Write an enzyme that holds these catalytic residues in place. Structure first.
Site, PDB file in Angstrom:
ATOM      1  N   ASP A 147       0.849  -1.186   0.000  1.00 61.63           N
ATOM      2  CA  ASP A 147       0.000   0.000   0.000  1.00 61.63           C
ATOM      3  C   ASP A 147       0.885   1.238   0.000  1.00 61.63           C
ATOM      4  O   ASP A 147       1.885   1.292   0.724  1.00 61.63           O
ATOM      5  CB  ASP A 147      -0.946  -0.003   1.198  1.00 61.63           C
ATOM      6  CG  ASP A 147      -2.055  -1.033   1.064  1.00 61.63           C
ATOM      7  OD1 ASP A 147      -2.289  -1.517  -0.065  1.00 61.63           O
ATOM      8  OD2 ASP A 147      -2.694  -1.358   2.087  1.00 61.63           O
ATOM      9  N   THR A 200      -4.801   2.099  -1.841  1.00 64.11           N
ATOM     10  CA  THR A 200      -3.926   3.264  -1.764  1.00 64.11           C
ATOM     11  C   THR A 200      -3.214   3.499  -3.085  1.00 64.11           C
ATOM     12  O   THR A 200      -3.395   4.543  -3.723  1.00 64.11           O
ATOM     13  CB  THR A 200      -2.889   3.062  -0.666  1.00 64.11           C
ATOM     14  OG1 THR A 200      -1.994   2.026  -1.068  1.00 64.11           O
ATOM     15  CG2 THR A 200      -3.562   2.607   0.600  1.00 64.11           C
ATOM     16  N   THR A 201      -2.397   2.528  -3.497  1.00 62.12           N
ATOM     17  CA  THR A 201      -1.542   2.684  -4.666  1.00 62.12           C
ATOM     18  C   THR A 201      -2.331   3.123  -5.890  1.00 62.12           C
ATOM     19  O   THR A 201      -1.872   3.976  -6.660  1.00 62.12           O
ATOM     20  CB  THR A 201      -0.805   1.376  -4.944  1.00 62.12           C
ATOM     21  OG1 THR A 201      -1.753   0.328  -5.183  1.00 62.12           O
ATOM     22  CG2 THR A 201       0.071   0.995  -3.759  1.00 62.12           C
ATOM     23  N   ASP A 240      -5.567 -10.426   3.802  1.00 64.29           N
ATOM     24  CA  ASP A 240      -6.209  -9.854   2.621  1.00 64.29           C
ATOM     25  C   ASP A 240      -7.654 -10.317   2.506  1.00 64.29           C
ATOM     26  O   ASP A 240      -8.563  -9.497   2.316  1.00 64.29           O
ATOM     27  CB  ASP A 240      -5.440 -10.224   1.356  1.00 64.29           C
ATOM     28  CG  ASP A 240      -6.012  -9.564   0.113  1.00 64.29           C
ATOM     29  OD1 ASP A 240      -6.915  -8.709   0.235  1.00 64.29           O
ATOM     30  OD2 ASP A 240      -5.560  -9.914  -0.996  1.00 64.29           O
TER      31      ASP A 240
END
Lengths: 517, 508, 509, 514
Positions: free
Chosen positions: D50, D83-84, D380
């Site tokens: 992230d 995020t990325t 995850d």
């Protein structure tokens, strides 16, 4: 700071990866030529051992980070296998350059290394499925401790070490438990002995002896009084040690401190034991009283050793002098003060035929370099031996396994038409570098030398015999007895193959440059 | 950490022992040249050094490869004697030998056994011209004597050589099955004698007698004391601090002068006129002890009565409190021998016994230092000459014989490593070569001829490179115990192949 | 350097200094403005619309512009919309002299040109007042001016901050026929929405509300910057953990050492304590015992805002406070100011003059950008109360004046002929600013704003309509500035210009 | 002084700087998506999937760079995921807008087309929003096992998923009352039967310290009374250090023993206070641990504080800052205290806990480099498995929707524009960068695939989208690759905002000067 990406990182990763594979490759195996390594301290360490080289290297990069890390998971569990796992990781990385230079993305090859890492460990599985019991495996334990004592060049006549590693693993680490015990194996040794001066102590040797030989050398079964209590200077951890500052003080303390130890050494024997192991020893004044009170006991026992002689013997815990009681005592099958053949190495053994919770291999040597020469060699032996005494799965070493792998690997590599068709095939190419770099060290041209084994694999298509690993000219894996536990070789790969691929998945690095470790 | 790859590593492996070896190869070999140690990192000094370690340790050894031999060659000297200059040059030779074979692109491993096996067959050929000289004691005498003079050689010793070749063998011929460093008691002082030394009957001790004490003691039965008095005699009440201020600071010195007197109570209880102790007393104390009328000798040496008790047949013991914790020692005399201006209180109970005191008188310590080692070296080579009385021809003649054989061997012996065995054999004749020009003589012919010449069976005939001449190693007396020569072969052959197999060096 | 020679201060410095200060406004003025991030000595991003807001943090070396930033602050306090206008207006005014400098007209000459013309323009400004409106109460009608004044100063919700500050400015007052400096203060609080913002008249302490609740109706405070660790005249107590036994005596003593405090607090009287400093562990627990409200650990912000609104003054020590040091508020109560539960006072006639618009968002800069707005909603509403006159939204009045001052140049003739022509030009960079934020040429705006040739409404503002420049009626759009705004924004931009326009080289040793 | 720059040279420097650091984030996300190990300072090295974390960790010196942090950091707080992508996106406009600012033409409006189509973007994805919960199964939890299997195989484990997928659903159903990322928290075990996760609704403990009493101190309680201790005890306990003497006359053996008993007491202060299991976060003396073994009150020295916090959340306990138990509430309870070696080292399992609110997986990895991405795969799932619960409405994963969303706007690039088809096309261009970022960071050509997908969308479709293993054409819905609908919306607003935000600023002031 900075962020280096892709080829930058690609040249950041394999670069620091390439060189340390080289220091170990001429250090590789028995013919691996040892490396004198000297600190800033004026130190000198002659090291063909990667882990020792890694312990010797503080060199700076995530690679050099991961390298000092990667071998030492192989060096404890399996022991031998420390060297190959790194050098081959570099060889894999050595390939990925050209292979990305072919225009195959680093993650396009990445699975292919691991995907073909399957066949190798799978081919290793095929080598020897043998598992032998302790009394049967003891010869293969020392037959492997032929090899796993061999690289440090402390091996033959060290079948002492080889045999003491047979029982030391068995004593604490069971065959069925297969939960590693290097923690309940006590690795122990002293300078002034000899490599051929070697023993496996079943219980705990306490370095200091009874306060006199004028009292018996021998405490019987059990009766070990576990004691934290001064009969010498206490040096308590709650307050600070100070001694008598006055002339009348040496008068009274001499008179006071005697009769209490008279009472206490009797009160120990009142509580009862033939051995009182004291965290804080008998003084020379308390020595003559241990003589005068007519009790055997140990003077000095380590602060931790007061737990050791408690746990390692299974002796029921007596915390201190005030907690002294009859039913709780340290335990022994017997207690001796044993001369090891060099009176310079002299310990009081509390020996366990009852329960050994720390078994003590006691090596000896003229000095420390020589006992460590034995110990890390005995370790890797003790390591593989314990691995083998769990499961005796072995493999013929020296790459003849991998020469047999690589052909089968690169073949089964091609089978998947996915671009790792080629990429897995190049993986197998790396499997051949270790016997290569070994054949370099062997004094042979590895190129032709491997093809001998290749031909021998073309003959055999598994290692049985092989090439030299020791330098002789009798080229054998079986008859030369170049053999590794089948486990750790796969563990070498599993440690070697992924770190590359893991570094492949991580090329995204915030650094001004490699040296950040 | 600093990673040193093989290019400089083998190179640094070569430079370390060579750069020191050249210094000691001057000293070592026969004598055409030496090391004059010109000393400044620590001082303004000019020194003359035939000692390897004095060349080694004084100068910076900082090369990690030079660490090896400076550490390893000293032990060889610390073991069998005169191994510093030996293990250094001989491996430095191999470093040259390796270097070519290295520069010839050859596995160090391939070079290992090539030398290492060649080390054996040379030590074997060394054992050949090793010729047992134990036949009679006169043979064993002159063997030891030739061997004692062998290690002393190539070193600066003034009057030392001829006396210790007597003494060292004297120390040998008394113990019979070993030599005596346990017996010979080395006493060093300023006597004004150049190197002049002698076997000391009893053991002399250095003190001025004065105050009220009559100086000479006759018919002296010593009272052996392992515990004397320093200044104050140590016991329960022995210490006090009264000082509250600067006056007491001057008044506390006066308080401890009382403690000198209570020491007399202990010795007056024992009753013996002659009380010999380890711990010294001063001249103002001499007032109190000499007026006591009993003779209390201070600093009577342990090894001194250890000489006596051995030769006198008595018992020297430890832990002396009351007279009988040590069996009373018997001397004929406690006397003062005056050597020049010196005044030496001299205990004579016995003369030149199986424990001897050796009085070393010299104006310089360094010569007395290098005289002790060569003595310390010879007796070890003499004690092994007690064991192995083979005295193998030295002066490079041994090198030749080994060089000839191993060369003959490398011819047949391997199919490849004939590289290193002859290379080994080459390093043999090296040590001969450096010193013949040092006499001006041509080593080439010598190492060519005289090797083959005496390796065709002249083996006694050998290298006099002091004269630069061909002469008999037995008759020239150039020869030494088969061990020390093989012993100086063991380490140096081992010293080179270590850094030879070292292809990388970490540096923190 | 701030010291100069070489005519830069005359023919260079001023026009450089102006567009530096300006050309925020050019994208920051009109129906919206485009925020401009500011960083301070404290590193953080502060978006700006109002001229005086970006210039407040901008630290200028300019000997020229230091006159003008004050004029914006003057303009700001006055009206609050047009401070942007002021920078970009003088942007047009001064530079035109460069031509008259190339043409060779002297200093006072063309200055007399803009002057008698800004006298001429100030004369026309009441004539160009277009309708009017106000209510001393109504939120919605007042909101529109407060909307459109903060338009330049806000890109955000125009109607929502219109309605709040209209509420705030009005409903903090019994009249709002009177309007003052702080009639509204803000507790900047995050959470929920930025349009969750609420007008609560009183002093909000977004700080903790502590002590046992004692009074609700009695909000009277004895205000203290004095921490209560036991700080009081005879013994000034602090919290000292140095030793354990001394801490044992603190808890004992503090209960009593806090006793004479909240006593002396409620002695001189209050049930609510403003503590600008700390309150100790046993100090607050005694306030729980004493039955007084300690609003503790306040800011200097919550300290001063009260000290401002109640007229009281914080005590750094503890002496019995006077009524000058003790304010009273309508009621002290726990209620959520834009959904935030702390102590929010009520202020109308007790001491008063604080509305709290809770400034909201997901960050402080959202609370700083709505800070940009309501500050003008404060300012313009005072003008609105001072004059309810409405005048075409910025740039719709310009096209009027330009035509008028144009032929006024030919009533001028003599060197001010052109300078008034240039003053007729000095007007029109404002819609240019508006159109340049819209990115489009005002050259199309100008001709269309001249198309009908009256200019009472038509303008091209900040829109997606202006994306192809399109006449809109700021008059009819609800964009109507206040006469004083239209008067002030011309006056100082002409005033600060002419005085910096006669400057010469700096003399320095 | 104060430095400032307005106009395009700032804005170019603005857009340039914002493009610089968000670059590093581009390459990072995926199964084959590169992991970013960042080294800040020196001995500090950090891996993240992230960006928001490393966005905070990486140096952002610009209003352009700093504004990238919070925006994905917002998405980091939103789903815990994405995020990325939000870092990838907000600055994606900048190169797409780059010709528009390099043509010099940016009506400050042009930002509004971002939000404009973002409306339609946050529309269509909530227009195509589909509940996975209600329809899938009835239990909805074997969907969660489907979401487990897919989100366990989303990072590492395709093989270990099914075994863990029941366990994931186990904890997800257990953990979802109050959801906290640590309260499924896996406790590593290595050396047992590998590739196996074992979920306990109670909590296993890493650290327990005993010797001389290692295995002879009682390790079992059918209810532990647990003092949760941050306390430190040593060889001996409190005694007066000032003006104290040992060796004196009569005090030699008295004071040593006096030091002893006070330690026994302070050690017993735990024991008689109703503490069976002593969890001591701080060191216990060597003979002091022996006394724990002597009093049959189990000692765990240097316990992980989270194990103490996992205790209070599972066990109904709370951390006791003093040896003598403050209350029975801070005393931890379970109905089982079992200490069992999996791999051969001692773990404290607090199980049968009164609250048992902190779930614990007992996970066995195959090797060193292998093990973690499994444990990451576990967390995850539980995130997006619960997020499959969290938002019922779900869209096909793998950038499936953004594909046609390019068309839909490049429809409006056709449809409306007087001009902004540039803007509309520039916006629609930002959509498929991620599956292009995904497939290509793997090394398989996304453009071809993406175009074929949109070519397949062209006939008709929405959910056509990249399954990322061989990263190629597929239907992520059919492929069971999902993130919920709002998750895209969550990214749609934030990243499309920062574009608007930085561009309306052509002028950046910094008061400190420089």
């Amino acid at each position: 700071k900075s962020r280096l990406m892709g080829l930058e990182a690609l040249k950041s990763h394999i670069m620091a990866a390439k060189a340390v594979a080289n220091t170990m490759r001429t250090s590789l195996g028995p013919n691996g030529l040892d490396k004198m390594m000297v600190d800033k301290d004026g130190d000198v360490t002659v090291t063909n051992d990667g882990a020792t080289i890694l312990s010797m290297m503080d060199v700076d990069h995530q690679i050099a980070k991961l390298m000092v890390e990667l071998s030492k998971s192989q060096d404890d569990e399996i022991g031998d296998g420390t060297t190959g796992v790194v050098v081959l990781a570099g060889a894999l990385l050595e390939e990925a350059e050209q292979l990305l230079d072919r225009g195959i993305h680093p993650i396009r090859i990445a699975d292919g290394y691991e995907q073909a890492a399957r066949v190798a460990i799978e081919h290793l599985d095929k080598i020897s499925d043998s598992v032998l019991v302790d009394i049967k495996d003891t010869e293969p334990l020392i037959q492997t401790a032929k090899t796993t004592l061999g690289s440090k060049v402390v091996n033959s006549c060290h079948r002492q070490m080889a045999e003491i590693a047979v029982n030391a693993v068995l004593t604490v680490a069971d065959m069925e438990r297969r939960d590693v015990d290097f923690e309940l194996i006590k690795v122990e040794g002293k300078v002034g002995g000899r490599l051929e001066d070697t023993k496996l102590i079943k219980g705990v040797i306490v370095d200091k002896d009874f306060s006199h030989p004028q009292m018996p050398k021998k405490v019987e079964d059990a009766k070990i009084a576990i004691l934290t209590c001064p009969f010498e200077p206490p040096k308590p951890k709650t307050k600070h040690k100070l001694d008598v500052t006055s002339v009348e003080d040496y008068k009274a303390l001499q008179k006071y401190e005697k009769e209490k130890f008279e009472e206490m050494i009797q009160q120990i024997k009142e509580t009862g034991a033939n051995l009182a192991i004291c965290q804080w020893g008998f003084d020379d004044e308390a020595n003559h009283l241990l003589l005068q009170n007519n009790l055997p006991a140990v003077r000095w026992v380590g602060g931790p050793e007061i737990e050791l002689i408690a746990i390692a013997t299974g002796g029921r815990i007596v915390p201190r002098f005030s907690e002294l009681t009859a039913e709780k005592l340290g335990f022994a099958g017997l207690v001796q003060e044993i001369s090891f053949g060099t009176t310079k190495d002299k310990m009081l053994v509390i020996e366990q035929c009852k329960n050994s919770r720390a078994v003590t291999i006691f090596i000896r040597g003229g000095n420390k370099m020589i006992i460590e020469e034995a110990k890390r060699s005995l370790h890797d032996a003790l390591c593989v031996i314990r691995n083998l005494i769990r499961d005796n799965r072995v493999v013929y070493g020296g790459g003849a396994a991998e020469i047999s792998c690589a052909l089968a690997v690169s073949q089964e590599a091609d089978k998947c038409p996915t671009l790792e068709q080629y990429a897995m095939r190049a993986f197998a190419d790396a499997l051949e570098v270790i016997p290569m770099a070994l054949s370099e060290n062997s004094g042979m041209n590895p190129i032709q030398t491997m093809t001998e084994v290749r031909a021998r694999q073309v003959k055999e298509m598994n290692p049985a015999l092989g090439i030299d690993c020791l330098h002789k000219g009798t080229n054998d894996m079986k008859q030369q007895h170049v053999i590794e536990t089948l486990i750790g070789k796969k563990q070498q790969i599993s440690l070697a193959t992924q770190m590359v691929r893991m570094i492949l998945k991580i090329d995204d690095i915030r650094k001004p440059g490699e040296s950040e470790e | 950490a600093d990673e040193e790859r093989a290019e400089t590593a083998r190179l640094t492996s070569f430079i370390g022992a060579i750069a020191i070896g050249d210094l000691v190869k001057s000293t070592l070999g026969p004598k055409g040249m030496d090391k004059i140690l010109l000393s400044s990192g620590r001082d303004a000094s000019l020194m003359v050094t035939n000692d390897g370690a004095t060349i080694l340790k004084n100068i910076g050894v900082d090369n990690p490869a030079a660490k090896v031999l400076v550490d390893m060659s000293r032990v060889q000297d610390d073991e069998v004697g005169d191994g510093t200059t030996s293990v250094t040059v001989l491996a430095a030779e191999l470093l040259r030998e390796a270097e070519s074979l290295i520069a010839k692109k050859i596995h160090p491993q391939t070079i290992i056994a090539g030398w290492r096996e060649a080390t054996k067959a040379a030590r074997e050929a060394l054992l050949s011209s090793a010729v047992d000289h134990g036949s009679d004691e006169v043979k064993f005498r002159q063997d030891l004597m030739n061997i004692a003079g062998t290690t002393l050689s190539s070193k600066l010793l003034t009057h030392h050589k001829d006396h210790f070749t007597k003494l060292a063998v004297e120390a040998v011929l008394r113990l019979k099955g070993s030599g005596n460093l346990e017996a010979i008691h080395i006493i060093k002082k300023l006597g004004g004698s150049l190197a002049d030394s002698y076997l000391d009957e009893g053991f002399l001790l250095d003190k001025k007698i004065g105050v009220n004490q009559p100086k000479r003691i006759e018919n002296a039965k010593i009272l052996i004391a392992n515990t004397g008095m320093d200044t104050d005699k140590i016991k329960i009440f022995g210490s006090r601090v009264r000082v509250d201020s600067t006056a007491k600071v001057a008044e506390i010195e006066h308080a401890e002068k009382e403690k000198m007197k209570e020491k007399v109570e202990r010795i007056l209880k024992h009753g013996i006129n002659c009380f010999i102790n380890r711990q010294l007393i001063y001249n103002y104390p001499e007032q109190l002890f000499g007026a006591a009328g009993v003779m209390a000798i201070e600093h009577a040496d342990f090894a001194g009565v250890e000489r006596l008790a051995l030769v006198t047949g008595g018992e020297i013991a430890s832990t002396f409190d009351h007279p009988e914790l040590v069996k009373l020692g018997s001397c004929k005399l406690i006397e003062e021998v005056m050597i020049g201006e010196d005044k030496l209180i001299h205990f004579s109970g016995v003369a030149l016994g199986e424990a001897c005191t050796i009085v070393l008188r010299g104006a310089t310590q360094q010569i007395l230092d290098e005289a002790e080692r060569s003595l310390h070296d010879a007796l070890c080579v003499l004690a092994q000459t007690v064991k192995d009385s083979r005295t193998v021809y030295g002066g490079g003649c041994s090198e030749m014989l080994m060089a000839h054989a191993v060369t003959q061997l490398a011819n047949r012996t391997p199919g490849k490593e004939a590289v290193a065995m002859e290379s080994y054999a080459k390093a043999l004749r090296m040590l001969p070569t450096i010193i013949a020009d040092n006499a001006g003589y041509d080593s080439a012919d010598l190492v060519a001829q005289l090797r083959a010449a005496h390796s065709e069976g002249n083996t006694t005939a050998g290298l006099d490179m002091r004269e630069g001449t061909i002469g008999d190693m037995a008759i020239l007396g150039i020869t030494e115990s088969f061990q020390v020569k093989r012993q100086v072969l063991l380490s140096a052959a081992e010293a080179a192949e270590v850094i030879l197999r070292v292809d990388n060096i970490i540096k923190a | 350097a701030k010291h100069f020679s070489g005519l830069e201060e005359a023919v260079y410095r001023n026009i450089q200094a102006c567009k530096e200060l300006a050309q925020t406004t050019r994208t920051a003025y009109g129906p919206n403005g485009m925020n401009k991030m500011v960083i301070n000595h404290l590193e953080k991003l502060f978006v700006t619309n109002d001229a005086a807001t970006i210039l407040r943090e901008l630290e200028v070396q300019h000997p020229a512009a230091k006159m003008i930033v004050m004029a914006s602050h003057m303009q700001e306090q006055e009206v609050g919309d047009g401070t942007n206008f002021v920078l970009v207006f003088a942007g047009a005014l001064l530079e035109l002299a460069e031509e008259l400098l190339r043409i060779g007209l002297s200093v006072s000459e063309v200055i007399e040109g803009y002057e008698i013309a800004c006298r001429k323009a100030h004369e026309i400004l009441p004539n160009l007042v277009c309708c009017s409106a106000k209510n001393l109460r109504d939120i919605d009608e007042v909101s529109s001016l407060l909307r459109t004044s903060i338009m330049s100063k806000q890109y955000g919700n125009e109607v929502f901050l219109a309605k709040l500050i209209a509420q705030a400015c009005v409903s903090i007052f019994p009249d709002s026929g009177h309007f003052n400096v702080d009639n509204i203060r803000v507790c900047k609080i995050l959470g929920s929405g930025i349009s969750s913002s609420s007008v609560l008249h009183g002093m909000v302490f977004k700080k903790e509300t502590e002590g046992d609740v004692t009074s609700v109706k009695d909000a009277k405070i004895a205000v203290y910057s004095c921490p209560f660790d036991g700080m009081i005249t005879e013994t000034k107590g602090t919290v000292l953990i140095k030793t354990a036994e001394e801490l044992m005596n603190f808890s004992k003593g503090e209960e009593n050492l806090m006793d004479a405090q909240v006593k002396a607090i409620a002695d001189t009287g209050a049930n609510v304590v403003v503590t600008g400093g700390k309150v100790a562990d046993m100090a607050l627990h005694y306030a729980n015992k004493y039955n007084i409200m300690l609003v503790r650990l306040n800011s200097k912000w919550d300290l001063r805002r009260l000290c401002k609104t109640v007229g009281a003054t914080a005590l750094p020590r503890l002496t019995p406070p006077v009524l000058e040091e003790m304010g009273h508020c309508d009621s002290v109560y726990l209620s959520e100011v834009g959904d935030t539960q702390v102590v929010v006072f009520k202020h109308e006639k007790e001491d008063g003059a604080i509305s709290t618009i809770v400034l909201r968002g997901s960050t402080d800069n959202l609370m700083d950008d709505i800070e940009r707005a309501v500050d003008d909603g404060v300012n313009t509403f005072k003008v609105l109360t001072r004059d309810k006159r409405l005048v075409p939204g910025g740039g719709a009045t310009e096209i009027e004046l330009a035509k008028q001052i144009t032929s006024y140049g030919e009533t001028c003739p003599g060197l001010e002929q052109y300078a008034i022509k240039k003053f007729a030009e000095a007007f029109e960079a404002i819609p240019r600013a508006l159109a340049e934020n819209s990115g489009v040429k005002a050259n199309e705006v100008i001709s269309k704003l001249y198309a009908v040739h009256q200019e009472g409404n038509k303008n091209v503002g900040l829109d997606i309509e202006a994306e192809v420049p399109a006449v809109k009626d700021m008059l009819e759009a609800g964009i109507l500035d206040t006469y004083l705004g239209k008067y002030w924004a011309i006056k100082l931009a002409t005033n600060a210009a002419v005085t910096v326009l006669r400057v010469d080289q700096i003399i320095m040793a | 002084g104060t430095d400032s720059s307005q106009g395009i040279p700032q804005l170019v420097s603005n857009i340039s700087a914002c493009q610089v650091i968000a670059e590093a984030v581009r390459t990072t996300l995926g199964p084959r998506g590169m992991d970013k190990l960042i080294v800040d300072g020196r001995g500090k090295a950090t891996i993240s999937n992230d960006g928001a974390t490393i966005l905070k960790l990486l140096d952002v010196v610009h209003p352009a760079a700093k504004t990238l942090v919070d925006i994905a950091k917002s998405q980091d707080a939103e789903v815990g995921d994405g995020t990325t992508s939000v870092t990838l996106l907000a600055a994606e406009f900048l190169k797409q807008v780059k010709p528009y600012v390099e043509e010099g033409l940016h009506p400050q409006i042009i930002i509004r087309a971002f939000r404009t189509a973002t409306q339609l973007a946050v529309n269509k994805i909530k227009e195509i929003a589909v509940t996975v919960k209600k329809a899938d199964k009835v239990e909805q939890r074997k969907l969660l096992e489907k979401c487990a299997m897919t989100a366990l195989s989303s990072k590492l484990i395709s093989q270990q998923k099914a075994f863990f997928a029941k366990m994931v659903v186990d904890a997800v159903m257990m953990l979802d009352d109050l959801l906290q990322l640590k309260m499924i928290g896996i406790k590593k075990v290595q050396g047992g039967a590998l590739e196996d996760s074992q979920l306990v609704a109670g909590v296993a403990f890493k650290k327990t310290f005993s010797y001389a009493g290692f295995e002879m101190q009682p390790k079992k309680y059918h209810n532990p009374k647990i003092a949760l201790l941050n306390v430190e005890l040593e060889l001996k306990a409190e005694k007066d250090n000032a003006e104290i003497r040992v060796h004196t006359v009569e005090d030699y053996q008295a004071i040593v023993d006096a030091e002893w008993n006070i330690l026994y007491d302070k050690l017993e202060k735990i024991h008689h206070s109703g503490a069976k299991v002593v969890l001591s976060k701080l060191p216990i003396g060597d003979v002091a641990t022996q006394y724990f073994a002597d009093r049959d009150m189990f000692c765990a020295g240097r316990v992980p504080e989270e194990d103490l916090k996992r205790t209070m959340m599972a066990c109904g306990g709370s951390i006791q800052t003093s040896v003598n138990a403050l209350s029975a509430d801070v005393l931890g309870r379970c109905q089982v205290f079992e200490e069992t070696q999996i791999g051969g080292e001692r773990y404290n399992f607090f199980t049968g806990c009164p609250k048992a609110k902190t779930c614990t997986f007992i996970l066995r990895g195959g090797a060193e480099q292998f093990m973690e991405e499994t444990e990451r795969s576990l967390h995850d799932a539980i995130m997006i498995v619960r997020r499959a619960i969290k938002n019922d409405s779900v869209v096909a994963g793998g950038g499936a929707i953004e594909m046609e969303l390019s068309k839909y706007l490049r429809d409006y690039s056709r449809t409306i524009p007087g001009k902004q088809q540039l803007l509309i096309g520039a916006y629609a261009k930002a959509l498929e960068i991620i599956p292009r970022q995904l497939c290509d960071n793997a090394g398989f050509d996304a453009t071809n695939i993406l175009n074929k997908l949109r070519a397949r969308h062209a006939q008709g479709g929405t959910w056509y989208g990249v399954d990322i293993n061989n990263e190629d054409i597929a239907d992520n819905f059919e492929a069971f690759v999902w993130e919920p609908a709002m998750v895209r919306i969550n990214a749609l607003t934030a990243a499309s905002e920062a574009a608007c935000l930085i561009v309306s600023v052509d002028e950046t002031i910094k008061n400190p000067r420089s």
